[PDB]
Design a binder for this molecule. Sequence first.
Ligand code: HEM
Ligand SMILES: OC(Cn1cncn1)(Cn1cncn1)c1ccc(F)cc1F
Length: 447
Amino acid sequence: AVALPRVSGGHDEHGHLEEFRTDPIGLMQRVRDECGDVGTFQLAGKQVVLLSGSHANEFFFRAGDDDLDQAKAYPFMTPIFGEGVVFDASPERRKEMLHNAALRGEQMKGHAATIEDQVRRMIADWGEAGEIDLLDFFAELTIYTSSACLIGKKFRDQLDGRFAKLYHELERGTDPLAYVDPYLPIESFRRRDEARNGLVALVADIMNGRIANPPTDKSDRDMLDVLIAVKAETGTPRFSADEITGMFISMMFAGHHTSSGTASWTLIELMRHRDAYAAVIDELDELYGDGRSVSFHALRQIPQLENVLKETLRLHPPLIILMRVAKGEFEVQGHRIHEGDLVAASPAISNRIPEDFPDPHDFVPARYEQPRQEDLLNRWTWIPFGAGRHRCVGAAFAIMQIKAIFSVLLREYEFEMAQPPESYRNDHSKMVVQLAQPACVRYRRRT
Ligand code: HEM
Ligand SMILES: OC(Cn1cncn1)(Cn1cncn1)c1ccc(F)cc1F
C-alpha cells in the first residue's frame, strides 16, 4: 500500500496532534507547502488527508454522503450534543438539530428585529464611554440572539450571563485529543461535563419556575412550555431537564461561536482599517436615512459592510478545518484515499492561496466589488462557509445577523482599539476556535 505524502515533524506522543493544538494553521500550511494539493498529517491514531487547491477541494465538497461522511468526523461534538435530540426520528442531523425551520424565510424579518433588540439590551448600560472585551461581549450577545431566535424570546428572557459562562466552558471542552477519545480523563473534558451539568440545572430551574406560575395567556407559550407539557404514557412528564437542555444546546451551537468570533473580527478589522470603517458609517447613516427599521435593512443590501464581512471571513474563518470520513477508496490527483481515512479541507489555508487571492494576508474588501468578485470566481477556494453538499445552510442568517448587529452598534457608538492592533488573535488550542483574551476595545457615543 503506497504511502501518501506526509508533512515533516509529528514526532510528539500523538504524532502531529500536539502541534495541531498549538499551531494548527502553521501546521496545515506546511502540509501544502511540502506536500502540495494532497498531503497528510497524523492526528493521534488517525491519519488526516488534507486537501488544498481548487481541484482537490472540489472533489471534497461535491462528494456524496455515501463517499465522504461528515457524521463521525467531529467526535468532539458528541459530548456537547449528548443523547440524540429530543425527537427520535432517523437522522435528525441538521434536520432537527439545526432545523432550517428556525432560519425559515418567513421568520427572517422577525429574527432581524429580535437581533436588534438583543443588541440594544446588551449596550443598554454602556453610558457615554467605557471599555469592553470582545469575547465577553460577543459571546454573551450571541447566546441571547441564538436562544431568542432558535428557541424563544420568553426562554432567552430567563437567561443571564451565567448561561454564557457555562456554554463557553462547554465549547472549550473540544481539545483535539477528542480524536483519541472525547471522554478521556482530561481537565477540560471534566470542566466540559461539569459545565453541561450546570446548564441542565439552569434549565431545570426555569422549568420549575414556569410550573409554579404558568402564562396568563395561552398564546405566549414558547418551545419550553410545549416540551414541559408533553406527557408520557402514564401521565408522567416525557422529557427530563437533561433531555430538553441537550436539545437546546444542540440547536444553539450553530448560532453561537461562529457568529460570535465573526462579529468580534468584523469590528477588529474595521478598527484596523479606519478607511473601510468610515465607508461603512457613511453607508449606514445614508441607508437608514430612509426611516426603515433594522429588520428592513438587515435583509437587504449594505454593500460596504458586506464586503468588509466577506473579507473578515476570508482571513478569519471560524472553522479553520472541515472533516469527513472516507467511506470508500478514491483517487485525487494520483493519490489514493482509503476507507476509514479522515479527509479534510481547510478554509484557513485555502482562503489565502496566493494564486487565487492577490495579497492573501491583506484586508481588501474591494475583492468582492463589481470587478474582481473573488468570492464568486474562486467557488472552491473561497470557503468561509464551506461549499457544495454541506455548504453552510445558515449563511444567509449569519450575514443578516452581522448586518443587524452592526447597524445598531456603529450608529450608536464609535470604537477604538485599546491594545496594539496585532495583539488581537484567536485561540486555536481547541477544535472550537475562540477569540483570545484580552480583546479590549474603547467606545464613546456618536454625536
Ligand atoms: C458567519 C457565521 C458562520 C460561519 C462562518 C459558518 C460556517 C460553516 C461552515 C464552514 C460549514 C461547513 C461544515 C462542514 O463542511 O463540515 C457550515 C455548516 C453548517 N452551518 Fe454554518 N456557519 C455560520 C453560521 C451558521 C448559522 C447562524 C447557522 C444556523 C443557526 C448555521 C448552520 C449550519 C448548518 C446546519 C451546517 C451544516 C450543513 C450541512 O452539513 O449540509 N451556520 N457552516
Ligand atoms: O459545523 C458545526 C460543527 N463544527 C465542526 N467544527 C467545528 N464546529 C459548527 N457550525 C458551523 N456553522 C455553524 N455551526 C455544526 C454544523 C451543523 C450543526 F447543526 C451544528 C454544528 F455545531
